Paper text:
The major facilitator superfamily (MFS) glucose transporters (GLUTs), encoded by the SLC2 genes, mediate the transmembrane movement of various hexoses and derivatives in different tissues. The two domains, which exhibit a 2-fold pseudosymmetry around an axis that is perpendicular to the membrane plane, enclose a central cavity for substrate accommodation. Exposure of the substrate-binding site to either side of the membrane is achieved through rocker-switch rotation of the two domains as well as local conformational changes exemplified by the bending of TM722.
To elucidate the mode of action (MOA) of SA47, we determined the crystal structure of SA47-bound WT GLUT3 (GLUT3-SA47) complex at 2.3 Å resolution. SA47 is unambiguously resolved in the central cavity, which opens to the extracellular side, consistent with the predicted outward-open conformation. The comparison unambiguously shows the inhibitory mechanism of SA47 to be blocking substrate access to the central binding site. The structural shifts result in the displacement of the extracellular gating residue Tyr290, completing the transition from outward-occluded to outward-open. While the benzyl group of the pyrazoloaryl tail forms a π-π stacking with Phe289 on TM7b, the two conformers of the aryl tail are coordinated differently by GLUT3 residues.
Author numbering: 4 to 471
């Protein structure tokens, strides 16, 4: 606890990327009908026959999904940037992609080009994939050890705030209209121009400068400013230790992450935690929501979702104030457990949907409580924890692997779930309850507490476990 404006500024400017990721994730839902009308008109205006609903659904599905494909590629490409350019400059450099993607999506209507929309979603996907790796890596290396998890939770906060804002902007009376939806999608350009202006005044990680570039006194002076104290000897020395370790060790690529015994457990934890986020059922809960919301008298679908967005935000903040006290294990487990209870309730309330006339209110309650438990742990923790499971040398390759598995599992779930729901119906949530319980067991037996521990302490403990 040594928090000056500089540290806040640096972390806040970095979480613009988190906001960007959240915004582009949530922005696409509301304007579906409007964009399909655009796609139809683009073909009709040629004088051609109007497209079938099958073709529209097809093009629309590609628009949505190609974003994930971009993210898979970008998140796995994180390793190409962070050691070569640094952590701060990597973020500055890739804003080219955010500007590019936003231009395509923003100009696709006036250019009357469905192809530009699809292309824009791919490029903004690439950008967001790089962000999901760059931001926690930067925050992790620049935060005081006692606040590493708290600050790391600001990544997820930026993401959920980004989602909320995109949804609100998606309202018909704001930017969600026939004449304003290019502005809706094009909006992502503005935070990029703001971030690029602000970033050069954010310092590079002192850890990176000292450990990777051997610039000790440069790191110290920066460390003194960020933590607002002249005595930073304990931290500077701990960085010297990590630096000595890295120059005595072979620097790991992706493939060797899996050949080294002392890396196997950390990397397996990292991947599994990414899965515990995307296979939680969090992507199934809303698939049903939009239709459950009608039955309960909402008759206002985006409004039902925005409300969930507020709950989404509140419990991310709750997680922020808990993660340094309760620890990562406890918050992850509690969240997994509460989601297990809610998904089970979802199955029951849906199975009794029309034998009893109150069940739609029950399902909504289950959905909101589900969202709350998701953000307690499984939402924010898996993003910043892999940065904690590794020291300086293998972190970049580890975050490329972890991040990719997160984006990939998200993509596969979205591909496979509609089928599963079609064959299992209400029982599909029981499958997630099984996943959630299994993940809960994994965390309880296999995931060490990382709260307040130095990277060196954590790594040595993994080395000790590997020696027997
Ligand atoms: C298809 O549009 C959307 O997914 C928006 C869904 N509604 C957002 C919403 C509103 C209210 C409450 C909770 C939520 N959610 N829901 C999921 C969700 C979430 N995750 C789960 C999925 N993820 C993700 C989504 C993508 F697209 C592409 C790539 C992704 O990771 C690589 C990242 C973290 N985090 C916070 N709130 C969330
Ligand atoms: C209908 C309205 C049309 C007019 C609209 C005018 C907007 C002008 C541009 C604003 C740039 C947006 C910047 C987004 C700020 C990102 C928030 C953030 O950085 O997150 C804070 C915290 O770190 C999270 O954890
Ligand atoms: C009717 C009897 C009254 C009981 C009704 C209960 C209803 C379901 C409650 C779910 C809350 C979720 C709790 C999460 C459980 C996970 C356990 C956990 O988090 O363990 C932490 C660990 O001990 C740290 O080291």
């Amino acid at each position: 606890q040594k928090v000056t404006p500089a540290l806040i500024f640096a972390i806040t400017v970095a979480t613009i990327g988190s906001f960007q990721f959240g915004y582009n994730t949530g922005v696409i839902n509301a304007p579906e009908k409007i964009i399909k009308e655009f796609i139809t008109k683009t073909l009709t205006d040629k004088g051609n026959a109007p497209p079938s609903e099958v073709l529209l659904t097809s093009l629309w599905s590609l628009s949505v999904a190609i974003f994930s494909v971009g993210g898979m590629i970008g998140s796995f490409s994180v390793g190409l940037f962070v050691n070569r350019f640094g952590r701060r400059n990597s973020m500055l450099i890739v804003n080219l992609l955010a500007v590019t993607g936003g231009c395509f999506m923003g100009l696709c209507k006036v250019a009357k080009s469905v192809e530009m929309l699809i292309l824009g979603r791919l490029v903004i996907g690439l950008f967001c994939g790089l962000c999901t790796g760059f931001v926690p890596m930067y925050i992790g290396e620049i935060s005081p050890t006692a606040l590493r998890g708290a600050f790391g939770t600001l990544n997820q906060l930026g993401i959920v705030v980004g989602i909320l804002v995109a949804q609100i902007f998606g309202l018909e009376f704001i930017l969600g209209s026939e004449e304003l939806w290019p502005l809706l999608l094009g909006f992502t350009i503005l935070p990029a121009i703001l971030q690029s202006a602000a970033l050069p005044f954010c310092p590079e990680s002192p850890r990176f400068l000292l450990i990777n570039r051997k610039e000790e006194e440069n790191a110290k002076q920066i460390l003194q400013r960020l933590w607002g104290t002249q005595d930073v000897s304990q931290d500077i020395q701990e960085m010297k230790d990590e630096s000595a370790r890295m120059s005595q060790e072979k620097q790991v690529t992706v493939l060797e992450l899996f050949r080294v015994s002392s890396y196997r457990q950390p990397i397996i934890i990292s991947i599994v935690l990414q899965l515990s986020q995307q296979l939680s059922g969090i992507n199934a809960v809303f698939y049903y929501s939009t239709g459950i919301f009608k039955d309960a008298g909402v008759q206002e679908p985006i409004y039902a979702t925005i409300g969930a967005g507020v709950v989404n935000t509140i419990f991310t903040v709750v997680s922020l104030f808990l993660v340094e006290r309760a620890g990562r294990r406890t918050l992850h487990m509690i969240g997994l457990g509460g989601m297990a209870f809610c998904s089970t309730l979802m199955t029951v309330s849906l199975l009794l949907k029309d034998n009893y006339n109150g069940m739609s209110f029950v399902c909504i309650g289950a959905i909101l409580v589900f969202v709350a438990f998701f953000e307690i742990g499984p939402g924010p923790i898996p993003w910043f924890i892999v940065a904690e499971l590794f020291s300086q040398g293998p972190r970049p390759a580890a975050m490329a692997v972890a991040g990719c598995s997160n984006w990939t599992s998200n993509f596969l779930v979205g591909l496979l779930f509609p089928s599963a729901a079609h064959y299992l119906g209400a029982y599909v949530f029981i499958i997630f309850t099984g996943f959630l319980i299994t993940f809960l067991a994994f965390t309880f037996f296999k995931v060490p507490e990382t709260r307040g521990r130095t990277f060196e302490d954590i790594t040595r403990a993994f080395e000790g476990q590997a020696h027997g």
